[PDB]
Target: scribble
Amino acid sequence: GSSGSSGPGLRELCIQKAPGERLGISIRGGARGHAGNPRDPTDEGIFISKVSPTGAAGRDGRLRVGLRLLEVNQQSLLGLTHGEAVQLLRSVGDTLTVLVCDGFESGPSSG
Model:
């Protein structure tokens, strides 16, 4: 009957990029980094803080600034710190598996 999105978000997704291209994405958080959630300081979650247009994601169409990073390449970011988590995203060959999902829209975008 009624339908709005009609698409998965918290499922297993991946980003196909060149054999040596940098994703070109940004994230904010960490087991220590400033509490990702401005509401509760006891939150070390990690969510995208920015995404490059020329990056594998920016072009992909599924990766945006607001998708909470659940796991990168079947590697839960739970336990590691921003520094570690980040390196985990760039530690992929030409394609990774992100389990992100619609977390919060950061307004309209261009391109």
Remarks:
- Strands lie at 13-16, 25-28, 47-51, 95-98.
- The longest helix spans residues 82-89.
- DSSP finds two helices and four strands in the chain.
